[PDB]
Design a binder for this molecule. Structure first.
Ligand SMILES: [Cd+2]
Ligand SMILES: [Cd+2]
Ligand SMILES: [Cd+2]
Ligand SMILES: [Cd+2]
Length: 37
């Protein structure tokens, strides 16, 4: 859902309901994250 920085519009894990939502000061913005990879 393009919902991120770590993730695109095709991100399976997020396509559900954005895994990273609670990654507040986490990797949300930091180009790459530690759930979806
Ligand atoms: Cd993400
Ligand atoms: Cd994701
Ligand atoms: Cd997301
Ligand atoms: Cd993630």
């Amino acid at each position: 859902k393009s919902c991120c920085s770590c993730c695109p519009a095709e991100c399976e894990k997020c396509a559900k309901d954005c895994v990273c939502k609670g990654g507040e000061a986490a990797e949300a913005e930091a180009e790459k994250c530690s759930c979806c990879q």
